[PDB]
Coordinates of C-alpha atoms in Angstrom, one line a residue:
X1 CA -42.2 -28.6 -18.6
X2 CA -39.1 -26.9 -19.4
X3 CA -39.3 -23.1 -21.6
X4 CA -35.5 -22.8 -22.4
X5 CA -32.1 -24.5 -22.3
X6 CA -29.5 -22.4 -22.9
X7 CA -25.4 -22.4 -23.5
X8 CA -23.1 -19.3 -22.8
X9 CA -19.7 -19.0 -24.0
X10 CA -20.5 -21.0 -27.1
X11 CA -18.5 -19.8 -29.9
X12 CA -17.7 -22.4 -32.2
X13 CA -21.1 -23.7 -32.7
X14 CA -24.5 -22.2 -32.6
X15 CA -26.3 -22.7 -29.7
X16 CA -29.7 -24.5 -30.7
X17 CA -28.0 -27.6 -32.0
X18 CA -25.6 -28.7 -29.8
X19 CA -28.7 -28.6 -27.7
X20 CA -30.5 -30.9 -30.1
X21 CA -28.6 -33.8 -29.1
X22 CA -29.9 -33.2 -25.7
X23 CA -32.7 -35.5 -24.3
X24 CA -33.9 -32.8 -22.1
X25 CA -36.0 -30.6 -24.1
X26 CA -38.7 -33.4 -22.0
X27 CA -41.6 -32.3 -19.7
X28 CA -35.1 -35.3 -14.1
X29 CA -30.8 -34.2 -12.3
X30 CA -30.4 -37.2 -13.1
X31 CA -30.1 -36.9 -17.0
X32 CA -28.8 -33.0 -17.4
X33 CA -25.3 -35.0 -16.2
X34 CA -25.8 -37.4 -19.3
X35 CA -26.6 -34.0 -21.4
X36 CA -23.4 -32.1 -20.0
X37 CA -21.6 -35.1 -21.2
X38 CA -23.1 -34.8 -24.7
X39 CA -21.7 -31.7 -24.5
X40 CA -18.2 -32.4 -23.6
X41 CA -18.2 -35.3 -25.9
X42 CA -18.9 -32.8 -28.5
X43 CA -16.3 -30.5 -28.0
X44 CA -13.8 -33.3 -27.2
X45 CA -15.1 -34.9 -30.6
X46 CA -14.0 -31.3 -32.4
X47 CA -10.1 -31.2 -31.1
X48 CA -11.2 -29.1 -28.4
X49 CA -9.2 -30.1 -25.3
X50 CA -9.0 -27.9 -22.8
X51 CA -12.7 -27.3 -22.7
X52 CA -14.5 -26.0 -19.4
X53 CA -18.1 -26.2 -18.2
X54 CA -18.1 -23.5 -15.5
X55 CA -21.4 -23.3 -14.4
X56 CA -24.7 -25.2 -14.8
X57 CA -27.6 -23.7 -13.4
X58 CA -31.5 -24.8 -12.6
X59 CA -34.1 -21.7 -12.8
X60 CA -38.0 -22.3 -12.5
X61 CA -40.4 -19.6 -13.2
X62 CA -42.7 -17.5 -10.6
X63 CA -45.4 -19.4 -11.9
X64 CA -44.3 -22.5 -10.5
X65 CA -43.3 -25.1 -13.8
X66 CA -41.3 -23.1 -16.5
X67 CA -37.8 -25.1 -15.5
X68 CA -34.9 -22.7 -17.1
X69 CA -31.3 -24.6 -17.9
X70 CA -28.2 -22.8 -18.3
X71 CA -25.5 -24.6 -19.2
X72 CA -21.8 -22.1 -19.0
X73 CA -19.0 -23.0 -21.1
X74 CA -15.6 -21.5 -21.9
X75 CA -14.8 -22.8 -25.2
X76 CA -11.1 -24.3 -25.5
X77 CA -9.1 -23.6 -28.8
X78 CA -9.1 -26.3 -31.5
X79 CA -6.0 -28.8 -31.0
X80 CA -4.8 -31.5 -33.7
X81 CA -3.1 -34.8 -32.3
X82 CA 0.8 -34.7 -32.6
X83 CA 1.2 -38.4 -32.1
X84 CA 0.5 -42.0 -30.4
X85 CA 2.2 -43.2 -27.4
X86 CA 1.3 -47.0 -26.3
X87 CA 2.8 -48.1 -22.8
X88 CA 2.0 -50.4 -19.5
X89 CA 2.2 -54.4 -19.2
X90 CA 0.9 -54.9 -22.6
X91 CA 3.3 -56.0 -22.8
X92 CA 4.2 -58.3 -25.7
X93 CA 1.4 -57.5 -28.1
X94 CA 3.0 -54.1 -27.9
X95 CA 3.3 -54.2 -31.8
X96 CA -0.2 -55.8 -32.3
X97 CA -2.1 -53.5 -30.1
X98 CA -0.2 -50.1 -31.6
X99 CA -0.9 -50.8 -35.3
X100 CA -5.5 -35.4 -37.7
X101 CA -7.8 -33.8 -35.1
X102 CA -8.1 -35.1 -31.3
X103 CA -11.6 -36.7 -31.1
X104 CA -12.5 -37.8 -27.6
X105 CA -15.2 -40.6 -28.8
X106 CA -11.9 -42.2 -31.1
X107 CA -9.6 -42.4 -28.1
X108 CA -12.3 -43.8 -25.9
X109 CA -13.3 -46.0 -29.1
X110 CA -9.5 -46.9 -29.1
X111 CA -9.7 -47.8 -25.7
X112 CA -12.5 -49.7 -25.6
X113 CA -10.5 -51.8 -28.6
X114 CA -7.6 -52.2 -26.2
X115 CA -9.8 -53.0 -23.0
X116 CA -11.3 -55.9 -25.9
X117 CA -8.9 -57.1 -27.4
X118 CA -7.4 -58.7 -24.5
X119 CA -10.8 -59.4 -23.3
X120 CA -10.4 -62.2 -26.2
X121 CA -7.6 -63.3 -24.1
X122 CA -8.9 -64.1 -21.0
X123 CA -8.1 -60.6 -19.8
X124 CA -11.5 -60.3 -17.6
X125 CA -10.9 -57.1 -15.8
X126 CA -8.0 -54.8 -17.6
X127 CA -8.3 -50.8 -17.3
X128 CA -6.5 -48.4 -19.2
X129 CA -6.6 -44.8 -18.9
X130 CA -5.3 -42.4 -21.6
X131 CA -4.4 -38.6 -20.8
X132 CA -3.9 -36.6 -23.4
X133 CA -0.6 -34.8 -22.7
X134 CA -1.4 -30.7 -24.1
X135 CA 1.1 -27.8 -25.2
X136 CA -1.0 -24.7 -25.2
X137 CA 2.3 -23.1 -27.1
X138 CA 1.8 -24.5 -30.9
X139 CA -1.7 -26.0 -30.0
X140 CA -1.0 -29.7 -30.3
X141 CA -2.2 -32.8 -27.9
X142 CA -0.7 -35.9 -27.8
X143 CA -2.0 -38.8 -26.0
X144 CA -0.5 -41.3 -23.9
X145 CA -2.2 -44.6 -23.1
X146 CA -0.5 -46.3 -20.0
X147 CA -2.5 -49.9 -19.5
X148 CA -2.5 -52.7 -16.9
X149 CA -3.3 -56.2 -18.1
X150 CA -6.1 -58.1 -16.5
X151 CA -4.7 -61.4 -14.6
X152 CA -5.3 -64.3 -16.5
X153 CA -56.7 -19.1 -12.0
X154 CA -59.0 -17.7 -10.2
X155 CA -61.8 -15.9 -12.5
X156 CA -61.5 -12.6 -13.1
X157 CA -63.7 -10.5 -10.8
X158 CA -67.4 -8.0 -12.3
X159 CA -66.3 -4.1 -12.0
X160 CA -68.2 -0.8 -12.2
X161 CA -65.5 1.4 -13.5
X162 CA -66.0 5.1 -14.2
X163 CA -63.2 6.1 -15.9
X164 CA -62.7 4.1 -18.5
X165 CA -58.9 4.0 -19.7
X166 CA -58.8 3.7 -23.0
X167 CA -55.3 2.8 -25.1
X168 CA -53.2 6.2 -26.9
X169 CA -51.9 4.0 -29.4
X170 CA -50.5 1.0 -30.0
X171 CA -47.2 0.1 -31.7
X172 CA -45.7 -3.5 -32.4
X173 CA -42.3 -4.9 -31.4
X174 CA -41.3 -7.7 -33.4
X175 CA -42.7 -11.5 -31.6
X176 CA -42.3 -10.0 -27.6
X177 CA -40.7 -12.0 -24.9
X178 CA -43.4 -14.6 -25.4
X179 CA -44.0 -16.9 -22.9
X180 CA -40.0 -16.6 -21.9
X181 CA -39.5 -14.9 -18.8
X182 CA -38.3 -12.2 -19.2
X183 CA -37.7 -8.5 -17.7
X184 CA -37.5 -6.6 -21.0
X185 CA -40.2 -3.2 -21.0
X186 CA -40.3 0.1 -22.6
X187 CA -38.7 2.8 -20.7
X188 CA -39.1 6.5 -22.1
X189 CA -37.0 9.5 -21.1
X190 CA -37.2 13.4 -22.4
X191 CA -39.9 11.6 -24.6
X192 CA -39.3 8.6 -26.5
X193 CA -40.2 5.0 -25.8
X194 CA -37.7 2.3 -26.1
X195 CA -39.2 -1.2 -26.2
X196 CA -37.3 -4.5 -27.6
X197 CA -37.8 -7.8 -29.0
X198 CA -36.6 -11.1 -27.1
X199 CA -35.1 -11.9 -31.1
X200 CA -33.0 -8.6 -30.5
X201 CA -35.0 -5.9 -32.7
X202 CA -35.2 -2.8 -30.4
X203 CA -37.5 0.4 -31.6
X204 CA -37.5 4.2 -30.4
X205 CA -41.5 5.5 -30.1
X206 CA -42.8 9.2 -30.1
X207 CA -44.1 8.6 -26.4
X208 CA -47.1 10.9 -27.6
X209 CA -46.9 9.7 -31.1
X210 CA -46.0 6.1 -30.6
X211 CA -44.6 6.1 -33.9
X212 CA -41.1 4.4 -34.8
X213 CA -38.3 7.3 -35.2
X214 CA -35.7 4.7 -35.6
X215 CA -35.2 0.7 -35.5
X216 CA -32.6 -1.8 -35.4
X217 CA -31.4 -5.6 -35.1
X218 CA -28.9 -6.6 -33.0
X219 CA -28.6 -10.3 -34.3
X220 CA -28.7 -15.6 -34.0
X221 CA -31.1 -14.5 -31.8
X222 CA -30.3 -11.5 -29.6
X223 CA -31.9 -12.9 -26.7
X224 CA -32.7 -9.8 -24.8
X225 CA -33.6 -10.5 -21.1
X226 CA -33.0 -7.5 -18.9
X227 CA -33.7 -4.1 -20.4
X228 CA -34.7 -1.6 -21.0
X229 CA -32.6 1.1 -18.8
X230 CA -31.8 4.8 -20.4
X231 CA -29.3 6.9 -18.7
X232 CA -27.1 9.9 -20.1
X233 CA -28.7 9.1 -23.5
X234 CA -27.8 5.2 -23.6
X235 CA -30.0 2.0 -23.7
X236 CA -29.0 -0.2 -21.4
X237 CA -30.1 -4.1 -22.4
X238 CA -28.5 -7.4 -21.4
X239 CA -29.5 -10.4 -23.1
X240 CA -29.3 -14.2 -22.2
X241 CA -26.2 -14.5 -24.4
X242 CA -24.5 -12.7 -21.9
X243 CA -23.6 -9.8 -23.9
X244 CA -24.6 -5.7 -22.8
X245 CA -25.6 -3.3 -25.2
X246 CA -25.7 0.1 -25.1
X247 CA -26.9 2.1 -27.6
X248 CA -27.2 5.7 -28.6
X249 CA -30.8 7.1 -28.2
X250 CA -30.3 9.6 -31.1
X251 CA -29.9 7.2 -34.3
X252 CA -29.8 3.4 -32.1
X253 CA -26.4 2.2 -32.8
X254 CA -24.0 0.5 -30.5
X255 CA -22.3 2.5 -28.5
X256 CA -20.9 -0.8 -26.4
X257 CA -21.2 -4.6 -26.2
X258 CA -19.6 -5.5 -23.2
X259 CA -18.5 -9.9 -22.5
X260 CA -20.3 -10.7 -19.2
X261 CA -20.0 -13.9 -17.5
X262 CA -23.3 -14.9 -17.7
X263 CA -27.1 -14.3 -18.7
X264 CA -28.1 -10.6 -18.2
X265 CA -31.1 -11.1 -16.9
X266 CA -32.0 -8.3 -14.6
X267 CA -32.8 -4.5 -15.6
X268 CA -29.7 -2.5 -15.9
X269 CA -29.4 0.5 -13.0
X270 CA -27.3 3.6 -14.3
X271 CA -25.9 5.3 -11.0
X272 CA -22.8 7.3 -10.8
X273 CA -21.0 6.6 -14.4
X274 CA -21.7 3.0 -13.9
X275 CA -24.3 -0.1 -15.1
X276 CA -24.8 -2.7 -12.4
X277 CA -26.0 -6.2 -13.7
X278 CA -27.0 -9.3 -11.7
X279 CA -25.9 -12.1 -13.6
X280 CA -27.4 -15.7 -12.9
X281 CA -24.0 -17.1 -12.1
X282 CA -24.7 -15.0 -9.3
X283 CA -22.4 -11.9 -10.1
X284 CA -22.9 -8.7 -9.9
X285 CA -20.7 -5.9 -12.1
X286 CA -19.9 -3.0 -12.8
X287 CA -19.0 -1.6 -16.3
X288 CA -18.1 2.0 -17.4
X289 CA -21.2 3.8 -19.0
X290 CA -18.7 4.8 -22.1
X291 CA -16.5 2.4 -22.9
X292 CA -18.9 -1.1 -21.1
X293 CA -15.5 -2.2 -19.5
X294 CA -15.9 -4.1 -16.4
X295 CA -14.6 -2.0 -13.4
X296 CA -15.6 -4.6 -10.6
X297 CA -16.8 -8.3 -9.8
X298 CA -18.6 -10.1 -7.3
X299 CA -20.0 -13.7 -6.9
X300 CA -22.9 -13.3 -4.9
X301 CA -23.5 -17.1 -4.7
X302 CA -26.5 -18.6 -5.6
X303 CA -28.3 -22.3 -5.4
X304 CA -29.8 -25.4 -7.1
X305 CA -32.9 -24.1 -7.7
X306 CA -33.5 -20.5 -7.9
X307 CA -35.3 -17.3 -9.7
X308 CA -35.6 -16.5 -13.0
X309 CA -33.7 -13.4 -12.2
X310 CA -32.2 -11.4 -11.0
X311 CA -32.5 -8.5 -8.2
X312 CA -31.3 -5.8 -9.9
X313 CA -29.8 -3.1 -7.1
X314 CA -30.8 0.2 -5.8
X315 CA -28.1 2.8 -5.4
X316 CA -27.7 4.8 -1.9
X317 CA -24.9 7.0 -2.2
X318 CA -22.1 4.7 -3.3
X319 CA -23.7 1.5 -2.1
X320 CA -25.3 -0.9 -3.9
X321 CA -27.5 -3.0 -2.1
X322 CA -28.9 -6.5 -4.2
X323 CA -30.3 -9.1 -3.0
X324 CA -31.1 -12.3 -5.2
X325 CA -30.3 -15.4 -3.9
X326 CA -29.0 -17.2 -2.3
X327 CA -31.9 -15.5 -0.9
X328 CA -30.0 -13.0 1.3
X329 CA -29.3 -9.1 1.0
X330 CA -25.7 -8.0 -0.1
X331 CA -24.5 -4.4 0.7
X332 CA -21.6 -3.7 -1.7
X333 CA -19.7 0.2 -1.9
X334 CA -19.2 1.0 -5.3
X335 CA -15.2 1.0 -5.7
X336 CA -14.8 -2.1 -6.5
X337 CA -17.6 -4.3 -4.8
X338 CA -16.2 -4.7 -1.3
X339 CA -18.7 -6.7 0.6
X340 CA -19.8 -4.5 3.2
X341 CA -23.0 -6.7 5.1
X342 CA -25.0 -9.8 4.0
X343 CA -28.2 -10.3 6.0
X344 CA -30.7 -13.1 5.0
X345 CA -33.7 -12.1 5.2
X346 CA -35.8 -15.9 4.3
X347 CA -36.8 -21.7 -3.3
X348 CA -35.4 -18.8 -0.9
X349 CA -34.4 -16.2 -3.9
X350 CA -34.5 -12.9 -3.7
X351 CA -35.7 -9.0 -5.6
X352 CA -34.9 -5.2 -5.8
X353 CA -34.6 -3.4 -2.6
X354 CA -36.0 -0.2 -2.4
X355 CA -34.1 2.3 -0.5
X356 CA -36.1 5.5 1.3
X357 CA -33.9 6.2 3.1
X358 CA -31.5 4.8 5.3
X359 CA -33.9 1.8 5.1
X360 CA -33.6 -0.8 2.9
X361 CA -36.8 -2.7 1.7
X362 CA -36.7 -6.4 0.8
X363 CA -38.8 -9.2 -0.6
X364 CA -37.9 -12.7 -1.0
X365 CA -40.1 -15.6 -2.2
X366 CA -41.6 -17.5 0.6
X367 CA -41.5 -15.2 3.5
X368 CA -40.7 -12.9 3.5
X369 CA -40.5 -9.0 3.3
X370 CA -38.4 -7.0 5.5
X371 CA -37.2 -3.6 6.6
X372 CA -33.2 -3.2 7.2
X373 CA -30.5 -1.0 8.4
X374 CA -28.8 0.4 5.2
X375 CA -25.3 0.9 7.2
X376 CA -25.4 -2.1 9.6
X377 CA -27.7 -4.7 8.3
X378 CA -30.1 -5.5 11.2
X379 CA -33.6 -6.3 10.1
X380 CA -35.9 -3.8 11.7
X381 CA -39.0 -5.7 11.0
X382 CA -40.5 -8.5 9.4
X383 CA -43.6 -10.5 7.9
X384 CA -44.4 -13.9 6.2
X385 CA -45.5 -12.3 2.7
X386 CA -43.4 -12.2 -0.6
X387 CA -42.9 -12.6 -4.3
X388 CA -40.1 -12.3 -6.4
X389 CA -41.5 -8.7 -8.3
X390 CA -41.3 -5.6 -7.2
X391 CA -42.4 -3.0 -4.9
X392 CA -43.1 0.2 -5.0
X393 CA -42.8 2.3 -1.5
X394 CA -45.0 6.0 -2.5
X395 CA -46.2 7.9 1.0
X396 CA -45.6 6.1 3.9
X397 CA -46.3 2.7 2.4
X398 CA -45.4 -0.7 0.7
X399 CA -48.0 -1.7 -2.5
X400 CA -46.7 -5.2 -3.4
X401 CA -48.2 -8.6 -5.4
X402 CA -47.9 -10.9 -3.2
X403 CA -46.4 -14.9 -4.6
X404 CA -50.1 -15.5 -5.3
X405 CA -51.3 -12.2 -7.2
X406 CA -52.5 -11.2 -4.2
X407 CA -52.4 -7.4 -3.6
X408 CA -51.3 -5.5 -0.3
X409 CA -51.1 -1.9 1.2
X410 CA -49.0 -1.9 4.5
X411 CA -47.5 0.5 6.3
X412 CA -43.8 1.8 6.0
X413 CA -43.4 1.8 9.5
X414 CA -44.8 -1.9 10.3
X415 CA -45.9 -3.8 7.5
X416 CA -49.0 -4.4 9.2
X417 CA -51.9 -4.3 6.3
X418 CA -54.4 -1.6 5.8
X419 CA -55.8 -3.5 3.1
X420 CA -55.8 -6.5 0.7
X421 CA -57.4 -7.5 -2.5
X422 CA -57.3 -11.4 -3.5
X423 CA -60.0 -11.9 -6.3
X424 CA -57.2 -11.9 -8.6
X425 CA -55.5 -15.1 -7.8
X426 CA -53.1 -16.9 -9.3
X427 CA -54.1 -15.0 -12.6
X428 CA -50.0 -14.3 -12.6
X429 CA -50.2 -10.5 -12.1
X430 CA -47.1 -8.0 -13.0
X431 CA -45.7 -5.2 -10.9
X432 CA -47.4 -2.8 -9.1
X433 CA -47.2 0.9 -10.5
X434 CA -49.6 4.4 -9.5
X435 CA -50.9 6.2 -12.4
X436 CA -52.9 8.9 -11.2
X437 CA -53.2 8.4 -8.0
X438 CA -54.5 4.3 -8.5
X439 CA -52.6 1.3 -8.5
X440 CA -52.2 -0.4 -12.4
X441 CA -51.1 -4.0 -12.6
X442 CA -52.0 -6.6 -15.7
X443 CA -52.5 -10.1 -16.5
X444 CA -51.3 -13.4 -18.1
X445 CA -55.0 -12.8 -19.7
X446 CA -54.4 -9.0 -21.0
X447 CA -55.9 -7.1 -18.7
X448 CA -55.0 -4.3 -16.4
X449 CA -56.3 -3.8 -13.2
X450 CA -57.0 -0.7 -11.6
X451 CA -57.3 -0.7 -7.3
X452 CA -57.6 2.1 -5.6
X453 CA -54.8 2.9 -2.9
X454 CA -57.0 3.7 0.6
X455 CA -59.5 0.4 0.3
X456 CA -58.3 -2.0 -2.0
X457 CA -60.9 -2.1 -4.8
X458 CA -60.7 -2.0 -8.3
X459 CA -62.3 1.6 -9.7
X460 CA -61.3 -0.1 -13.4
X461 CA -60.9 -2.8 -15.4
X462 CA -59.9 -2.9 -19.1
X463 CA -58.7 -6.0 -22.2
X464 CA -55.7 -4.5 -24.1
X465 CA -54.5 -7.5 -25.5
X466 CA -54.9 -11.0 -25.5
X467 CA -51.5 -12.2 -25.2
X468 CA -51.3 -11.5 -21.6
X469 CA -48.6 -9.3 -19.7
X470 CA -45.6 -10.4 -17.9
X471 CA -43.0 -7.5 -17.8
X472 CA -43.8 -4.0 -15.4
X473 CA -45.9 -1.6 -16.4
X474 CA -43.9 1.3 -16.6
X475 CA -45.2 4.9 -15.5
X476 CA -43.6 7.9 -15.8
X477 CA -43.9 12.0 -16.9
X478 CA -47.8 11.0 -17.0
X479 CA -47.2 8.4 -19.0
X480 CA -48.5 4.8 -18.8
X481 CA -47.3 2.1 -20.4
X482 CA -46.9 -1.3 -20.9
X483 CA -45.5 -4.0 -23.3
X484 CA -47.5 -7.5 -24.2
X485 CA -45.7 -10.7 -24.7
X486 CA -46.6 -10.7 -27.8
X487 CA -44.5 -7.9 -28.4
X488 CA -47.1 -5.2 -28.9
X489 CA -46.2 -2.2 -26.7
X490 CA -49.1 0.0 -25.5
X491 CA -49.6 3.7 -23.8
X492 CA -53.1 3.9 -22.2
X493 CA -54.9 7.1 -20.7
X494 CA -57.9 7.9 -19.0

């Protein structure tokens, strides 16, 4: 099963129906080629030589089927045909054989005419090939046809929880991601909670009202993957049509849209005047937080089969250190994205280091999780445990998921477990967050999951909504909260 194909850098034509001529959208390499050349054949059909597919890229989900296709164009200009030019050993039906905008399918139709026609004459085996001849100065193509002639889920688990949480309020937010992978979830800041739609609706909640205070559309679907970051009163959000948005907290409008060069998948960090985005072309950039121009590049590199993305970095003092695939960790100063160290630390993809401090922590799917040297990039220890979500490092410890919502407190020093809680399996669990003093996680199911930190076991359980959750719970100024994939963001309290 696939969730999503997608096309990035298509201007000319909207995305979802170039698409429908693909045979893809089925339940398999082997026929994306025939797809990509649906594609081409399109464009070429439209007078658009010069037309580039950059990048084509095979995602799968966490949950292991949810195959993700991006397909990354840079569309050509349009180019009309300036003429007909007929040569080779035709060579004396020259006059038989030679008797608007460039379509690729005519000249190929034409040649399959030519390659015919002498077929009628015995010619068994003739092959022509036709370049068309470009001048990217007054935008005209003409085409030359030299030709030789032929010869002749595990359930959930019982629970006696005192306290009961109970949910503040509850406010919606458009359709939600759905079941599109996605890393889009509130974030709040000096008191107001920004959630988005996956369409491209983004609202502004009274965090202790939960009540809109201003809303807007940024749509052709927005696509919003990676979000939602707030820093210096902007809202960071990068959608899947590779485009940035930043927006001003106080009435919502566009500060910025910034070009990237592919799907803005991961959550936007805001460190030092700057917003770093992993992009699943593998690159990582930097734009200005005023103006969303890009400052630096760099190609990380990635693989086949990989994430559904994308580590987004931690800052430590001018450093940015990211892993993602190719499932490797990449140091990178800040003016302009020098490489400093890559050290791997392993479907071998990677997610966010944590940095505290001095020591970078890393998690990779398969094995595994590892401690490293910010400055050098020697792995200080290891393990065999991982997941591609995140981590959070309070005290002297690591509370991860593990690939199998499994659930895991080990020491900072050793990552050898104190304790581990397993009853939730496979029940595709989000990331792990303390609210008051216990760890809050929820489910593909709706629920949310509260373990206590020195054991392992859960002092709470609670149904918020039905949908199920996907995207972090977020905690923060005593405030919990979370976002559905239906949409319907929620702030729960004791």
């Amino acid at each position: 099963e696939i969730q999503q194909i997608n096309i990035v850098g298509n201007h000319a034509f909207t995305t979802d129906e170039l698409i429908s001529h693909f045979q893809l959208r089925d339940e398999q390499k082997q026929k994306l080629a025939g797809d990509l050349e649906t594609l081409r054949s399109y464009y070429l059909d439209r007078g658009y030589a010069r037309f580039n597919i950059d990048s084509t890229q095979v995602s799968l989900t966490p949950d292991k089927k949810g195959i993700y296709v991006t397909v990354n164009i840079t569309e050509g200009d349009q180019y009309k045909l300036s003429g007909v030019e007929v040569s080779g050993n035709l060579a004396g039906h020259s006059a038989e054989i030679e008797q608007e905008l460039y379509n690729g399918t005519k000249v190929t139709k034409m040649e399959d005419d030519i390659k015919k026609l002498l077929g009628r004459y015995g010619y068994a085996y003739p092959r022509v090939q036709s370049m068309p001849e470009i001048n990217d100065a007054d935008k005209t193509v003409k085409l030359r046809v030299n030709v030789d002639a032929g010869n002749r889920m595990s359930p959930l688990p019982t629970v006696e929880n005192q306290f009961t949480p109970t949910t503040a309020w509850s406010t919606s937010v458009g359709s939600g991601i759905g079941n599109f992978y996605s890393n889009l979830h509130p974030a709040l800041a000096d008191n107001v909670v920004y959630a988005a739609d996956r369409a491209g609706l983004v609202k502004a909640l009274n965090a202790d009202d939960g009540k809109e205070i201003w809303s807007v559309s940024l749509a052709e679907p927005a696509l919003l993957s990676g979000g939602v970051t707030v820093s210096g009163g902007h809202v960071y959000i990068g959608s899947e049509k590779a485009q940035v948005y930043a927006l001003n907290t106080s009435d919502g409008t566009v500060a910025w849209q910034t070009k990237v060069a592919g799907e803005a998948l991961s959550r936007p960090v805001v460190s030092d005047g700057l917003v770093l985005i992993h992009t699943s072309n593998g690159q990582l950039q930097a734009l200005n937080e005023a103006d969303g121009a890009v400052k630096w590049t760099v190609n990380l590199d990635m693989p086949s089969l990989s994430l559904r993305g994308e580590s987004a970095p931690t800052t430590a003092f001018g450093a940015a250190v990211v892993g993602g695939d190719n499932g490797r960790v990449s140091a990178v100063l800040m003016e302009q994205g020098q490489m400093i160290w890559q050290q791997r630390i392993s479907s071998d993809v990677d997610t966010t280091p944590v940095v505290v401090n001095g020591v970078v922590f890393a998690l990779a799917y398969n094995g595994n999780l590892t401690a490293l040297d910010l400055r050098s990039g020697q792995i200080m220890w290891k393990r065999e445990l991982g997941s591609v979500n995140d981590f959070i490092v309070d005290g002297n410890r690591i509370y991860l998921v593990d690939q199998n919502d499994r659930v895991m407190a080990l020491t900072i020093d050793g990552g050898v477990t104190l304790w581990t809680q397993s009853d939730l399996l496979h029940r595709l669990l989000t990331s792990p967050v303390l609210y008051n003093g216990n760890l809050v996680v929820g489910d593909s199911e709706g629920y949310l999951h509260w373990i206590n930190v020195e054991d392992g076991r859960f002092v709470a359980q609670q149904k918020v909504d039905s949908s199920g959750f996907q995207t972090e719970p977020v905690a923060a100024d005593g405030k919990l909260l979370i976002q559905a994939k239906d949409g319907t963001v929620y702030s729960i309290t004791r």
